[PDB]
Ligand binder design. Structure first.
Ligand SMILES: CO[C@@H](C(=O)NCC(N)=O)[C@H](O)[C@@H](O)[C@H](O)/C=C/C(C)(C)C
Ligand SMILES: [Mn+2]
Ligand SMILES: [Mn+2]
Length: 284
């Protein structure tokens, strides 16, 4: 047996960031200045995005190595926070629209945007950790779902097939292809197993802003006319549900849970379209 439905816990105090680490503009504001930026980046921005992506990937991998029964989601956030700050990076989630932590931790039926707290991971859980770094005036965003202890076959397979969907989508990225191929590939692959691909949450362009106004759908919708071009940078971050797509948001305003409490899995990378194909910016 796996655990039953989650409830929110208590947050630790806000984690500080040394003042020499520049903040994104939206920290200490209610909204963010984003959504109207160009989608193709300049070579100088891309170079800085490789640095931000590698730091985010290191923070994700170090917090993922900690995932085990008995560990809290707050302890994962401490590891991610300290990794970013030791690397001179600001955690992009911290203070975005008042989000109180440095990464998102989404167990089990939480589709996304779970808030690190006193929740104890236990055997059988699947734990998504989502970390974004802001350094050099740019962002790098990545996430992965990690098993804790011996995960039930249905849940294990959900995670492994969501990772495979994500990688198949990434491997479609090439200049001249329609962006809509990403969602066509993910949803065709997920529908082999009877899973439902989340529609209301999406990938996005990313650069000097976190969510730059480019939207990447993870379901099939061939009427989008956007083409991938060299220098475009965006995330692929599909959420895939065992159950229905209906969802609820907790009173914290962030945590999104499936209404049927069936589990859900996600993986994410920040990608660059190159002249011949794709480059994963959020790799070690
Ligand atoms: C699904 O989540 C993505 C997203 O909201 N996409 C756009 C959308 N409207 O669906 C998001 O970019 C995550 O990858 C990111 O790590 C988290 C950021 C905050 C919690 C600070 C917002
Ligand atoms: Mn993310
Ligand atoms: Mn993202």
């Amino acid at each position: 047996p796996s655990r039953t439905a989650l409830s929110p816990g208590v947050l630790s105090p806000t984690r500080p960031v040394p003042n020499w680490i520049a903040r994104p503009e939206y920290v200490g504001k209610p909204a963010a200045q984003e959504g109207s930026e160009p989608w193709v980046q300049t070579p100088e921005v891309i170079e800085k995005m490789r640095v931000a992506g590698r730091i985010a990937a290191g923070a994700l991998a170090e917090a993922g190595k900690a995932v085990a029964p008995g560990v809290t989601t707050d302890e994962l956030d401490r590891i991610a926070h300290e990794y970013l700050v030791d690397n001179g990076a600001y955690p992009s989630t911290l203070g975005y629209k008042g989000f109180p932590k440095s990464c998102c931790t989404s167990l089990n039926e939480v589709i996304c945007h779970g808030i690190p707290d006193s929740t104890v991971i236990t055997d059988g859980d699947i734990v998504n950790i989502d970390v974004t770094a802001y350094i050099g005036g740019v962002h790098g965003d990545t996430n992965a779902t990690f098993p804790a202890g011996d995960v039930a076959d249905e849940h294990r397979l959900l995670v492994d097939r969501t990772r495979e969907a994500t990688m198949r989508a990434i491997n479609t990225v090439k200049p001249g292809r329609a962006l809509s191929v990403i969602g066509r590939v993910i949803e065709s692959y997920a529908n082999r197993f009877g899973y439902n691909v989340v529609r209301d949450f999406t990938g996005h362009g990313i650069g000097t802003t976190f969510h730059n106004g480019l939207v990447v759908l993870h379901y099939d919708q061939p009427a989008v006319e956007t083409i991938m071009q060299p220098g475009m940078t965006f995330t692929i971050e599909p959420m895939i549900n065992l159950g229905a797509l209906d969802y609820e948001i907790w009173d914290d305003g962030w945590t999104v849970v499936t209404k049927d409490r069936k589990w859900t899995a996600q993986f994410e990378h920040t990608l660059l379209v190159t002249d011949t194909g794709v480059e994963i910016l959020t790799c070690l």
